[PDB]
Symmetry: D2
Subunit: 428 residues, 4 copies
Amino acid sequence: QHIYDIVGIGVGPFNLGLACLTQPLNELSTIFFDSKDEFDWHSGIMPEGSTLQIPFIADLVSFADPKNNYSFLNYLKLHNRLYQFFIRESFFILRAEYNLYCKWAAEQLENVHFKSFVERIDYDESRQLYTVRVKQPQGEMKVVTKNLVLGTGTTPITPKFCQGYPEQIQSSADYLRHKKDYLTKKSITIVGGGQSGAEIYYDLLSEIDQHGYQLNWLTKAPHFFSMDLGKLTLEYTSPDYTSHFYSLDEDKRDQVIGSQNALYKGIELSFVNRIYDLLYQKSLHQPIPTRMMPNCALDAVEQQSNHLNLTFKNSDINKRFKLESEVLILALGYEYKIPECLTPIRTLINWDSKGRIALNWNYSINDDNTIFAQNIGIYSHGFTVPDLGMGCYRNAIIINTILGREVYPVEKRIAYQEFAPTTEEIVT
Amino acid sequence: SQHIYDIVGIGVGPFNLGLACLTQPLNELSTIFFDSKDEFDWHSGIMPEGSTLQIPFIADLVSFADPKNNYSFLNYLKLHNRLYQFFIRESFFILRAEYNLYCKWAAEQLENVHFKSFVERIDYDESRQLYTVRVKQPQGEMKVVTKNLVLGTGTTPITPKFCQGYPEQIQSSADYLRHKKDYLTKKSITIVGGGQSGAEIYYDLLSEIDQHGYQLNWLTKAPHFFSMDLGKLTLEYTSPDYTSHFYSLDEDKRDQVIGSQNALYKGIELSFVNRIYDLLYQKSLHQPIPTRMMPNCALDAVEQQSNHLNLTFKNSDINKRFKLESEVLILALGYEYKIPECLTPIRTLINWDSKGRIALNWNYSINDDNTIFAQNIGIYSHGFTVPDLGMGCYRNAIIINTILGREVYPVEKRIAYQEFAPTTEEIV
Amino acid sequence: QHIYDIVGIGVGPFNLGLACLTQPLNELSTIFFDSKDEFDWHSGIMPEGSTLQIPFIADLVSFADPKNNYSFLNYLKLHNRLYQFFIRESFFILRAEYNLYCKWAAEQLENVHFKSFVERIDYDESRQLYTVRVKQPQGEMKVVTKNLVLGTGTTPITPKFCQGYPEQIQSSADYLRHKKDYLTKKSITIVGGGQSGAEIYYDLLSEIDQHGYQLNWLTKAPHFFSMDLGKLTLEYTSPDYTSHFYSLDEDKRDQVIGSQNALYKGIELSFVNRIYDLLYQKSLHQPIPTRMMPNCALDAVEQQSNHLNLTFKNSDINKRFKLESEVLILALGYEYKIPECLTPIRTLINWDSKGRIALNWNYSINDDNTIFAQNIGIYSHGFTVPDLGMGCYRNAIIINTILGREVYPVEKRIAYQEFAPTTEEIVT
Amino acid sequence: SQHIYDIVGIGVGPFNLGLACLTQPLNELSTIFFDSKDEFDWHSGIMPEGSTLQIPFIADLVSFADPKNNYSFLNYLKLHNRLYQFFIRESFFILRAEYNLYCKWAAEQLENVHFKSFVERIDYDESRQLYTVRVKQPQGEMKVVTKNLVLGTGTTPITPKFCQGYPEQIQSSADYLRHKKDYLTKKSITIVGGGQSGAEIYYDLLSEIDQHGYQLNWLTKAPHFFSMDLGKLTLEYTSPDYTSHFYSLDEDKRDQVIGSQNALYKGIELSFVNRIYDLLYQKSLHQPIPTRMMPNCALDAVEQQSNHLNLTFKNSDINKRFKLESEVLILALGYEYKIPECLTPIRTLINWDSKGRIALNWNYSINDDNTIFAQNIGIYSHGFTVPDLGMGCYRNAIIINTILGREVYPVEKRIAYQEFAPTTEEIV
Ligand SMILES: Cc1cc2nc3c(=O)[nH]c(=O)nc-3n(C[C@H](O)[C@H](O)[C@H](O)COP(=O)(O)OP(=O)(O)OC[C@H]3O[C@@H](n4cnc5c(N)ncnc54)[C@H](O)[C@@H]3O)c2cc1C
Ligand SMILES: Cc1cc2nc3c(=O)[nH]c(=O)nc-3n(C[C@H](O)[C@H](O)[C@H](O)COP(=O)(O)OP(=O)(O)OC[C@H]3O[C@@H](n4cnc5c(N)ncnc54)[C@H](O)[C@@H]3O)c2cc1C
Ligand SMILES: Cc1cc2nc3c(=O)[nH]c(=O)nc-3n(C[C@H](O)[C@H](O)[C@H](O)COP(=O)(O)OP(=O)(O)OC[C@H]3O[C@@H](n4cnc5c(N)ncnc54)[C@H](O)[C@@H]3O)c2cc1C
Ligand SMILES: Cc1cc2nc3c(=O)[nH]c(=O)nc-3n(C[C@H](O)[C@H](O)[C@H](O)COP(=O)(O)OP(=O)(O)OC[C@H]3O[C@@H](n4cnc5c(N)ncnc54)[C@H](O)[C@@H]3O)c2cc1C
Ligand SMILES: NC(=O)c1ccc[n+]([C@@H]2O[C@H](COP(=O)([O-])OP(=O)(O)OC[C@H]3O[C@@H](n4cnc5c(N)ncnc54)[C@H](OP(=O)(O)O)[C@@H]3O)[C@@H](O)[C@H]2O)c1
Ligand SMILES: NC(=O)c1ccc[n+]([C@@H]2O[C@H](COP(=O)([O-])OP(=O)(O)OC[C@H]3O[C@@H](n4cnc5c(N)ncnc54)[C@H](OP(=O)(O)O)[C@@H]3O)[C@@H](O)[C@H]2O)c1
């Protein structure tokens, strides 16, 4: 019977930020649902000492309002860790601490409900009402709302040729769940040279002398490339660039986004460099039983005895080769999967030439501007669509759109670079 | 006229400015703050381009007490369109010039913070238990009445008596920038004092030594141009833990301890030490640099000559005196607390220690009433972080809590992994 | 009448290194010629403080033989800079010191002749000897030799449409000759986003407050990207990778080189970050009169009243635009131009399908293996062909080839990575 | 047997090893070296994986004297296929395990460097002007005669008197790796000493604390866990300039000066201090770490209890003593010079100062004939760099020049920008 203004579907950092930023707005009735038991930010792939790769300003609220109660600094103040964090004097939060922080913020918000799987959404055009059915442990529930905000995140990619070997092939995302088993194996092969694979490789490399596994690491990319966090390149993480990229033609958007892996993927440079320093240190007396191979794409898997035969394609020599491995860790990246709850309103969503969800500038995905998208469409808003540092930018625009006024005024120019000439400098 | 303030702040440096920022939210308290300068100014005469604070930006006016407060540096950054850029810059250290803009911004918002206001005299009325504070402003003298004083008159450059009276030739490092243009035309410049002040002037003048004709001399009495020890295990001394520990030691041990801690808060920022050497290396490539640097050298006498000063130095290593000629002498000998003249009529109401110094209670009051509180007084009583901008919020919280008689701003008790004393039970 | 074993054409760092490495080998008779007045390593684009981008081990000899008299370390020892260089504790030599280093070495070798322009080479098919004709101020030298080593380096790129404007368009290579005029202009435009452009941008941005120029910097690259010097990418600077790249198909070689701009071009990361910090600092009080545009390619210059009209294509928006500018600095990179002296023996040199000089693995470019190439064939030996870190490698192979002996034995594997599988794992 | 040596080196740590490397190309000198250990070993018992030297690699056996020398670390790297790898690693600090292999490799080249050779006794024959050196070897007792002696017997762990006689429970930091496996099974470990040895054991044990059940206690009597000051202006004290300055001072001043300089060559390396804090921060995220760190605490009593030690410390801040229980105690109290027993028969030929210490001449000889030289003796005589590996070549050059009577390895007189004394003409 109560009509919500917003239902958030999924509570990752982005919708959690939205809860924190709408909490102070008494005008808005909001509710949020997440299927997990409690907040968890990728803790299956979270070795001790792992950090976010961007500064702590990219918390749930501070880019929109440093005064908000759920800033990371206030969390630190309230948990007797503020002085300690600044003695540590790193801009990068420990991923475990970031988990504790978001858990704390999620726990303060009564309208944020975990153990809540959104299974179905329907729309009543006469009342402009979405009905959201949620499976909760005590049973199914119904809420109605004017606006939806989708924040269902992304999930590991598993190629179809890699399915059906649950005992031997696992995703990087579940690494800590299996590391104990991994340490007893004769051979471990990581596929994918991004940050996930790099952290797993460093973690296994650190312990390689205490066990008897061979440690292989392969990526199809032309090298184990570093993420380019050069500051002039960081200006692309900006309202400036977001707005510029969204204005671009659709094919141009795909080309540009295709060239930008080094802006937000790859390996953190200092981490790259720690891997090398560890290789140097452990090869002092005898060679390390480890192999690293760029330009190699896994394209086949077959069982044989009690190991896998992994077939790769070396793009440089254009040949295929086989390595044997007892376990295969896929660190192949994450992808957006459409939530099944959207199925009955699919005809309410706009789609582009290529059948992807089409976004408006303000992150709505329908003509009525009542369905908004968290972390959807790097092809539409650019490579910072998954960047925690642009989460406040997006939530502020969502909030401003829904309430129809500048609740959180958003910056328009923070970059010294210009990504286009003024309309008056163009030559006919 | 008949209005009675809870607090009068005398002086508005960062410490009393922070106190005004942290009390403004408290509508119980009626507070007012007076400063003699034309406007807020934080040592802008010794503020070369690119110069920074030596502690992280968390050490702003309010954030260690309350990260939600409206006058945090991050909120300043947000309201001035510098928040995204500050974090692309990704330094913990605020440009000294930006810290000046930030404080002037805070001061301008607080209508009870009055500059052009010299506090000439303080009297006490034992019948009413009220201080009357006489203030000289451009339009004349005014009187205000208050229950509590908070003394925030800061520190001033040390100019020994033998260096006074040579205005054209001897200047304080505090006024470097007003005299830099004249300096560049001289044939010899001698900087005395090897702290951060002297170092920045040395680097600045060395940086342009090739475009002029000055010999550049730099001498310190310290046993070497030592660096400030900001080792994180030493930073735990910047903490409630250590302030409380130090305060509890006896007076003579406190003088011993503080006399041993020059490296914890004075000396030169390490990376700045290193930039100086690198510049020496770079500029000595083709020919010697006309510069001299001499440790273990104390300025001993100053004799006027024809067109220069004869500077006598005592070298303590060889226990001999020597003379240098210099056209101008830049005094970078450090800063000292001078008891303001307004306090004279109430001196017999203030507590003094066994060495004739103002004595402070744990809560920073200097009388039995606990109605007069001291900002940046008593390095010998609360330790070397008494002038530390990072402990300003801790002191302000305790003052505010004392005056209101409750924990408005609750204060940390242990933040250090180290213990500075065993437990009662472990003592033999 | 005397028959040399080696004539070196051009004495840049690579042939200078070959002189230093063949000098201890009395079985070789060698001579080198260079047209400049003395050794000069790009001193026209060498702002004070600028450094090499690779560690000092990439000197003239040390990768082949650290004992050699012409190591950088020995240079520093003999010049009372060894202790100082290691207090400075940077791996990167100042460019001005590297110049002094190479000048020092070139001056010790009497068989290294400057003011010597190699004008013509002919080949005696019967005696298997080359006749080299050298123009010198006092006349012409004719020497006979069994082998040639070409080390004529590379030169700045000037597009045809930028030619014919000697007053208003200059190369970045001549920056320091023109800086004084530049500082007087109303507008300065730098085209090219590599290290050359960046250092000029930084150098002019540093002084922008003292003059009245607008400072524009544009590149056609998708961003002002950083050079990827991650240690796992540095492993591509190796015999391992050089041999691997050399073996690849011709078109694969061009594809790979096309994708590797970040391995050896773009901007030094520490240097990109200093640029941003300077922009941050200098915009504190007012906006900087500077513009930076990626994705912009200069494609026309037109003369006007007292300035140039510069038309650019912005590839993101697929439109062209015009800026006005009094001076235009070309920082578009360097290119190999084949020396005129080779014209008579062109028929001796091997060419590939694109009409480029075709190199054998041992860096010879003819079937006799008597003409060797320094810094030719990025399309054949890969992106490290101009890498000072690989000069001793190539020189050892050139020396070993000419003598038919392992005089300087060369490493076959220094990398943890493998760029190809073992022969036995290949799948048919 | 009757062969008359020019030099007998007693002890072969790095300093006499470098002397062997520097004298080996001088055929005028007949030298022999004896060391009592089974082979060269540089503190391998306190050599955790990844531990490094704290000064740059230029401070190898020979390179400050002669970068061309065959025994340079760079030459070592090249011949062991680690030169390229070392410079990709791009750290100035050699892993202590690698430096160990380097010194082992150098010692293996020198047929005149004999291990398993304890110099038992030294006599002097006035009639022959020869020292007889009696050496205990596995085979028997070897005698050799020699004109000069160079004492290089190093330093040994400090063990207070009240800490002797508890072999199963108290061990030196020097033997940490012999006992680490036992340590990990204990309930309580206590490290006394806050220097680099203490820090490395502390960090090593802290890293593994979660997988075990020890409480980990660390205490130093220093007023904080101070960092070693390696500011480059302080690095200039590691120089011939300062050694000559320090040597020239009077004896009491030398003791005073050396007393003030702990931060210059002791303490903890700054980056290591900061890693310890970062690890403490990381491992306290969920539960408090079972560890204690106490400065200002001097161990002054050990007391056997049943299953553990009662450790009594004096907290000098509060001037009280307290007891901690500990199953094991690790002494990281530093190292001392002990006079070798073999010098006893020639004690009356050695010069002694007014305090009973070995008195050194400027050229490092300790007798009037200038035929007995001292490695790593006389910190009170030649200053804090007497044990500094970066000054080994300087001392060795001066020893070799003295014995040969000419400037064989010329020695720098001034490397420092600073002056530690005025010119004679300036003195009053
Ligand atoms: C290991 C890792 C580290 C990363 N580190 C960084 C970083 O340092 N900086 C940065 O800018 N980016 C980083 N990213 C990228 C990005 O920030 C993360 O992917 C982030 O978790 C995405 O945020 P979110 O709110 O979109 O989705 P998520 O954090 O994925 O959360 C979405 C949640 O919605 C829930 N959900 C899905 N469907 C339903 C449903 N039908 N009903 C109810 N709930 C549902 C799921 O439980 C899911 O957990 C990282 C990504 C990974 C994988
Ligand atoms: C150049 C410099 C840089 C420093 N940098 C740092 C740093 O990076 N980190 C750190 O922790 N510490 C730093 N310090 C130390 C310390 O923080 C400063 O000295 C700081 O300014 C002290 O603040 P304050 O409120 O005590 O006094 P101040 O900032 O000195 O302010 C005192 C004010 O009181 C006014 N006043 C005095 N008497 C009267 C009166 N009778 N009536 C009215 N007004 C009066 C004066 O006009 C003055 O403006 C620095 C000090 C200096 C000099
Ligand atoms: C500004 C700049 C900085 C660079 N920095 C680095 C770096 O830090 N690290 C790195 O690995 N690479 C660097 N490079 C790339 C490369 O190392 C340089 O281009 C290097 O100068 C090339 O060396 P060289 O021996 O090929 O040719 P050069 O240094 O170009 O020298 C060739 C010489 O041959 C002479 N010559 C030409 N023709 C004749 C003739 N017919 N007769 C006689 N003499 C002739 C010329 O006078 C010329 O000086 C840099 C390049 C530039 C332009
Ligand atoms: C753990 C540790 C790390 C250090 N790291 C550094 C550093 O990074 N940088 C730096 O500048 N300094 C460092 N030092 C200080 C100094 O360099 C070392 O103490 C160094 O080992 C001293 O060198 P040495 O040649 O004097 O003596 P040692 O290395 O002690 O060698 C002494 C040798 O003499 C032998 N010997 C003794 N008596 C006899 C005898 N009667 N007959 C035969 N042989 C005998 C011993 O067996 C021993 O091998 C370190 C010290 C320690 C303890
Ligand atoms: N030791 C040092 O610090 C130092 C100093 C200077 C140079 N170097 C080295 O010397 C080499 C050359 O450096 P460089 O900066 O002179 O050349 P560069 O690295 O090739 O940079 C030139 C840039 O200008 C772009 N460009 C070319 N034509 C253009 C056009 N019409 N319009 C707009 N942009 C255009 C290029 O685009 P593309 O990316 O598409 O080619 C490229 O990005 C580099 O490897 C460099 O590292 C080193
Ligand atoms: N390359 C490396 O990484 C490395 C590793 C180990 C050692 N070293 C070098 O070797 C030298 C010795 O280092 P070290 O750490 O073994 O010893 P150290 O530097 O001399 O420090 C030992 C510490 O224990 C303190 N101490 C002495 N007696 C004590 C007592 N009864 N109770 C409590 N504390 C006591 C000492 O206090 P005081 O300060 O009052 O004397 C000192 O701080 C140093 O120069 C070091 O730099 C280098």
